[PDB]
Amino acid sequence: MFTLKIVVYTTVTFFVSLFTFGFLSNDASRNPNRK
Amino acid sequence: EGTGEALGIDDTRLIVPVILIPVITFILYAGFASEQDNEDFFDTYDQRR
Amino acid sequence: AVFPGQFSDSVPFLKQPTNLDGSYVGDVGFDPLGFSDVFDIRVLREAELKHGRIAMLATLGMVVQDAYTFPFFDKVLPIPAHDVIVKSGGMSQILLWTSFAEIFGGIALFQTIQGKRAPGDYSFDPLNLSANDLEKRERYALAEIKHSRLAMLAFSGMVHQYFITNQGVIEQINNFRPINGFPDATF
Amino acid sequence: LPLYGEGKLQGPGTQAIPGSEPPPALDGTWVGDVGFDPLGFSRVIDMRWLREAELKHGRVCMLAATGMIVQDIALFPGVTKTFGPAKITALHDVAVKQGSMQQLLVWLGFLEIFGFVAIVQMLQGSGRQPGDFGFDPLNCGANTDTLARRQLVELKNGRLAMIATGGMIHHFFLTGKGPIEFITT
Amino acid sequence: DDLAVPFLERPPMLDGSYAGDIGFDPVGFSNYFDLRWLREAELKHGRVCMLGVVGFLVQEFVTLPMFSNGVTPVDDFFVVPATGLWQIFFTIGFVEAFSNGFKLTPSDMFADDRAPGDLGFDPLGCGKDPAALARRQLVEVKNGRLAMIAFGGMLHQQLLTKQGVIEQLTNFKAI
Amino acid sequence: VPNVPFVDEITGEPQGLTAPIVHFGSVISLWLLFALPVWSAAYKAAGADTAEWVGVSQVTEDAPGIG
Amino acid sequence: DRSYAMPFLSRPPALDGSMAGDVGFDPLGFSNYFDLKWLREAELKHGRVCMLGCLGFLVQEQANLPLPGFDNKLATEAFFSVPAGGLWQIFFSLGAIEIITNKGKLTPGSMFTGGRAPGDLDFDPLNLSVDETALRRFELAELKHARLAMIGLGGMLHQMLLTKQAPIEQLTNFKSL
Numbered sequence: 001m002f003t004l005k006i007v008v009y010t011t012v013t014f015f016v017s018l019f020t021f022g023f024l025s026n027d028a029s030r031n032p033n034r035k
Numbered sequence: 036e037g038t039g040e041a042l043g044i045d046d047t048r049l050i051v052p053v054i055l056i057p058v059i060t061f062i063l064y065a066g067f068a069s070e071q072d073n074e075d076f077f078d079t080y081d082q083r084r
Numbered sequence: 085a086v087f088p089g090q091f092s093d094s095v096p097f098l099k100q101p102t103n104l105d106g107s108y109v110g111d112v113g114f115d116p117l118g119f120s121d122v123f124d125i126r127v128l129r130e131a132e133l134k135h136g137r138i139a140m141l142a143t144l145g146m147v148v149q150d151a152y153t154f155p156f157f158d159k160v161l162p163i164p165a166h167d168v169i170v171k172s173g174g175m176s177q178i179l180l181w182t183s184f185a186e187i188f189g190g191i192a193l194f195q196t197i198q199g200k201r202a203p204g205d206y207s208f209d210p211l212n213l214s215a216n217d218l219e220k221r222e223r224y225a226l227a228e229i230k231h232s233r234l235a236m237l238a239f240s241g242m243v244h245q246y247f248i249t250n251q252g253v254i255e256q257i258n259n260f261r262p263i264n265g266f267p268d269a270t271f
Numbered sequence: 272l273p274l275y276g277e278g279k280l281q282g283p284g285t286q287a288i289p290g291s292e293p294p295p296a297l298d299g300t301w302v303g304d305v306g307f308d309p310l311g312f313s314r315v316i317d318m319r320w321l322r323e324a325e326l327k328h329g330r331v332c333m334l335a336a337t338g339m340i341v342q343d344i345a346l347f348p349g350v351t352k353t354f355g356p357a358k359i360t361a362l363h364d365v366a367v368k369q370g371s372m373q374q375l376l377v378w379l380g381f382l383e384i385f386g387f388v389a390i391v392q393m394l395q396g397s398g399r400q401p402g403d404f405g406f407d408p409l410n411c412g413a414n415t416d417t418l419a420r421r422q423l424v425e426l427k428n429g430r431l432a433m434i435a436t437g438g439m440i441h442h443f444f445l446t447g448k449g450p451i452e453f454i455t456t
Numbered sequence: 457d458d459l460a461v462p463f464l465e466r467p468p469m470l471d472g473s474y475a476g477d478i479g480f481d482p483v484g485f486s487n488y489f490d491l492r493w494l495r496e497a498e499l500k501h502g503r504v505c506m507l508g509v510v511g512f513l514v515q516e517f518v519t520l521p522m523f524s525n526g527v528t529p530v531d532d533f534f535v536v537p538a539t540g541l542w543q544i545f546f547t548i549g550f551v552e553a554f555s556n557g558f559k560l561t562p563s564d565m566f567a568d569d570r571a572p573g574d575l576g577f578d579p580l581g582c583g584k585d586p587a588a589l590a591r592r593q594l595v596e597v598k599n600g601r602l603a604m605i606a607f608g609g610m611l612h613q614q615l616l617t618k619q620g621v622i623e624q625l626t627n628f629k630a631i
Numbered sequence: 632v633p634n635v636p637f638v639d640e641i642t643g644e645p646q647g648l649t650a651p652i653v654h655f656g657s658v659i660s661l662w663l664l665f666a667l668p669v670w671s672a673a674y675k676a677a678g679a680d681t682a683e684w685v686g687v688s689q690v691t692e693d694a695p696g697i698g
Numbered sequence: 699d700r701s702y703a704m705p706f707l708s709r710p711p712a713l714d715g716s717m718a719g720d721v722g723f724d725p726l727g728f729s730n731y732f733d734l735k736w737l738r739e740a741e742l743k744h745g746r747v748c749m750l751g752c753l754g755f756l757v758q759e760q761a762n763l764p765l766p767g768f769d770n771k772l773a774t775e776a777f778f779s780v781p782a783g784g785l786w787q788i789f790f791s792l793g794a795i796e797i798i799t800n801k802g803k804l805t806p807g808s809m810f811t812g813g814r815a816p817g818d819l820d821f822d823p824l825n826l827s828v829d830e831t832a833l834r835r836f837e838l839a840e841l842k843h844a845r846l847a848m849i850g851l852g853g854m855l856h857q858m859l860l861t862k863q864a865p866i867e868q869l870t871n872f873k874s875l
């Protein structure tokens with residue numbers, strides 16, 4: 001049960017961190033009208 | 036359940052991934068960030084990547 | 085030193101420390117570990133004079149506290165009195181006032197780094213014992229630094245002999261005993 | 272630093288090991304140089320550190336030998352009460368608990384901090400020679416020729432005292448007797 | 457003249473023009489802030505504290521018919537009705553916005569370059585003489601500097617011992 | 632003291648920013664904060680640029696794998 | 699053309715006198731395949747951690763904060779006694795400085811783009827090394843102590859784990875087997 005808990009925490013944190021630091025990586029510039 | 040632990044963290048083990056995985060992601064993001072032109076701008080958004 | 089060569093007069097087998105030219109009072113060329121080569125001699129002399137000026141008051145305070153305590157404070161030895169007064173809030177008053185003084189002490193230190201004030205040289209001579217006379221000031225400064233060093237060592241002694249013997253300094257001199265019950269103790 | 276007896280002792284033309292020749296570090300200037308270094312410690316380690324170690328060992332071991340003898344002939348009053356009858360290495364363990372050996376370690380370490388500084392300073396060209404701590408209060412080393420000789424005596428007696436102290440300690444391990452008692456057996 | 461802290465150099469901006477200037481600013485607030493704003497704050501604090509000191513003295517022995525007296529003057533703030541305190545606050549706001557010309561910011565208070573503390577309040581003509589004004593400017597600032605400390609002490613040892621300042625002096629006891 | 636506030640009810644120990652130990656830690660915090668501005672400048676003015684401050688080692692420097 | 703530390707092996711091409719810790723020892727030859735600046739920075743950083751870690755093993759083991767969960771000598775078993783709360787706020791303190799010293803540049807493709815030499819985070823409060831000779835001897839001293847302290851924390855830690863005894867205690871007790 002705890003093993004499943006820590007695995008799910010690992011997965012959730014991984015994807016949430018990817019989302020967080022991906023939208024923080026100057027996402028507004030990723031448009032076809034840049035330059 | 037219903038115990039009131041902060042972020043559901045009842046075991047101290049749960050914190051190791053919760054703090055480290057953002058830190059590895061932060062380290063990877065810092066290589067991107069340090070490469071950017073971090074001076075100010077007067078625009079609605081930054082067009083420099 | 086038995087062989088020819090230039091060496092510190094303090095330690096004949098070690099060189100004269102480089103930044104200890106000799107201008108400073110009490111400069112016996114004693115810096116084996118070379119702090120002066122790593123730090124300002126100005127800032128280090130400030131620290132020395134501050135430690136000495138605190139420790140001389142500390143030594144005389146221990147002696148007087150053993151001899152006499154005020155009618156309103158209890159009669160406890162100098163070391164165990166610390167907790168009695170920290171609670172009484174007295175130490176949280178000495179600390180406040182000394183911190184208030186040391187704000188300007190630190191500003192003066194930063195002005196010593198800029199070479200505007202000699203280390204430890206406040207303009208404190210209200211009775212004017214040696215302000216007019218310069219050679220008297222130099223002699224008194226040498227005596228000040230000697231007393232500073234001696235009082236630091238004496239304070240360290242008088243506290244550790246208490247930590248072992250559990251006696252005041254006057255009590256120890258009147259009733260001197262060896263530590264650990266050695267008049268009857270084996271191994 | 273002219274060498275006393277250069278030609279008969281401590282000098283060129285006196286090479287101890289006839290077949291072998293000495294390392295290039297062992298020149299004719301050093302004191303007590305009989306051209307003896309078969310294992311070749313000198314080429315690896317600087318000669319100043321090596322002579323510092325030799326003189327420190329010799330000076331420590333002369334005191335150690337005379338201590339192990341004098342402790343048998345006589346003892347300071349009161350040691351027999353605190354310390355029971357206790358010879359060379361048992362007395363170490365007893366005195367460690369007594370706390371005397373802590374004081375010896377503290378103060379000899381305090382002196383050896385400045386010994387470390389002196390070794391450092393000599394090894395960076397301070398001009399100090401090995402083992403020269405400027406200690407000659409009686410001015411008996413003032414004359415240069417007598418100083419020359421006394422240096423080789425210091426080295427040789429240090430070596431003899433080193434071997435002697437090894438002897439006394441291992442004889443104690445064998446018989447559990449001191450030097451004076453061991454010799455009369 | 458003599459320097460307040462003789463082991464620290466005189467501050468550069470703190471020239472001897474304002475009354476009561478003995479070259480005292482070790483931490484260096486003059487360098488990083490307008491000395492006119494600081495002088496105005498000094499005089500305002502001194503004036504409110506002089507008035508408050510006299511308030512502590514008079515309130516201990518006097519109480520108007522409509523109000524009731526507390527154990528100490530500091531207690532008079534709490535027995536008094538709450539609405540009147542807000543009336544006082546808004547009256548002081550009107551006085552401090554009208555008297556300052558409705559210029560209540562450091563960037564605009566001295567647009568007209570008036571002297572700090574010169575709110576144009578001078579009924580009875582005191583200080584009309586050029587020489588008397590110079591001495592009275594010094595008297596004001598030194599009395600205000602005294603009264604800030606005095607108000608602080610009287611407040612804190614009226615709260616610590618629930619006793620007015622005069623009654624404390626007539627019946628002093630250790631804390 | 633009777634009317635001192637921010638104090639405990641039964642313990643009698645002052646608590647918070649008005650405690651004796653918080654004052655002590657506050658002095659040491661300001662010490663740690665003032666250490667770098669003070670001793671860094673002490674280092675800047677004097678420093679070990681004496682042209683004699685040099686590390687010394689027992690082994691011969693011909694082959695120490697020296698940098 | 700033969701390594702000094704490994705006489706039998708030929709010298710690694712990358713390894714060189716210029717490094718300040720070179721003795722020709724890279725038998726694997728990692729140097730050939732990674733940024734040697736990155737490798738030196740990693741070596742000095744691991745060693746700077748371990749140099750403090752061994753002394754910690756030792757000081758924590760004798761003295762300790764009088765705070766309630768701070769007093770547990772066996773360091774191995776101490777990490778858990780002090781709360782992770784504390785261990786985390788410290789981990790976060792080291793994070794701040796990681797990014798402070800490295801100045802944001804903390805990836806292999808970005809760390810040294812600013813010209814920072816490896817293993818320097820611009821720290822030199824004392825023991826100044828403006829003297830290249832002094833820098834040259836001090837860097838070898840630092841590298842040797844880094845390498846030694848690695849072995850150290852390793853032993854102390856694995857050993858504290860083996861016998862539940864802190865460093866000084868274990869050897870004195872030296873319960874063997």
Ligand code: KC2
Nearest residue numbers: 522523536537538539540541542543544545546547548550
């Ligand atoms: C200097 C400051 C100041 C000014 C400039 C000012 C001006 C005016 C004006 C002019 C426009 C009017 C018309 C007005 C009227 C009333 N004032 Mg008032 N007042 C000031 C101060 C106080 C204080 C301290 C108190 C107070 C009060 C009352 C009451 C009582 C009502 C009641 O019966 O409850 C009434 C009717 C008392 C109070 O509200 O008591 C509950 C009270 O304590 N005022 N006040």
Ligand code: KC2
Nearest residue numbers: 765766767768780781782783784785786787788789791792
């Ligand atoms: C050098 C590194 C370092 C820094 C820079 C740093 C800074 C600050 C600051 C500054 C902004 C604050 C305000 C703060 C506060 C707290 N620190 Mg912290 N701290 C560091 C180190 C440790 C260690 C080793 C421990 C620790 C702890 C706590 C607790 C305990 C709360 C509790 O548990 O009730 C609190 C409230 C202990 C802990 O959490 O465990 C008991 C603990 O062991 N800290 N700490």
Ligand SMILES: CC1=C(C#C/C(C)=C/C=C/C(C)=C/C=C/C=C(C)/C=C/C=C(\C)C#CC2=C(C)C[C@@H](O)CC2(C)C)C(C)(C)C[C@H](O)C1
Nearest residue numbers: 749750752753822823824825843846847850853854865869
């Ligand atoms: C950098 C710097 C500065 C500085 C500084 C400072 C504070 C530097 C501090 C450096 C430190 C603390 C270094 C520690 C090194 C320790 C080592 C090598 C340990 C080895 C242990 C071994 C091999 C072992 C072992 C053992 C094991 C495993 C098993 C046990 O049973 C036995 C045993 C215990 C023997 C300053 C401030 C001057 C400023 C300057 O501008 C820059």
Ligand SMILES: CC1=C(C#C/C(C)=C/C=C/C(C)=C/C=C/C=C(C)/C=C/C=C(C)/C=C/C2=C(C)CCCC2(C)C)C(C)(C)C[C@H](O)C1
Nearest residue numbers: 332335359360361363364433434435436437438440441444
């Ligand atoms: C105190 C204490 C302890 C202890 C202890 C101590 C301190 C023990 C040991 C002490 C000393 C001084 C040992 C000396 C050994 C000398 C030897 C083997 C000489 C060899 C000579 C040779 C090969 C000669 C060579 C030669 C010579 C000269 C002449 C011919 C040529 C040549 C071949 C070159 C413990 C451990 C019991 C623990 C206790 O709790 C506390």
Ligand SMILES: CC1=CCCC(C)(C)[C@H]1/C=C/C(C)=C/C=C/C(C)=C/C=C/C=C(C)/C=C/C=C(C)/C=C/C1=C(C)CCCC1(C)C
Nearest residue numbers: 184505530531532533534604605606607608609611612615
């Ligand atoms: C309590 C209460 C009751 C009713 C109303 C309300 C609820 C608002 C509330 C009001 C609270 C108010 C008005 C609080 C005001 C606080 C005051 C005036 C505090 C004053 C603190 C003063 C202090 C420290 C002074 C200490 C000064 C020192 C050492 C100066 C040092 C020195 C200097 C600068 C130069 C010469 C040498 C010397 C003397 C060493």
Ligand SMILES: CC1=CCCC(C)(C)[C@H]1/C=C/C(C)=C/C=C/C(C)=C/C=C/C=C(C)/C=C/C=C(C)/C=C/C1=C(C)CCCC1(C)C
Nearest residue numbers: 748773774775776777778848849850851852853855856859
């Ligand atoms: C496990 C645990 C317990 C408590 C804390 C926590 C939960 C966090 C967790 C922490 C664990 C940590 C910090 C583990 C760290 C591991 C460490 C420091 C391991 C070190 C291992 C070192 C080893 C093998 C060294 C062996 C070296 C050798 C042969 C070298 C050989 C040699 C070489 C290479 C060249 C010259 C010749 C010579 C000397 C023979």
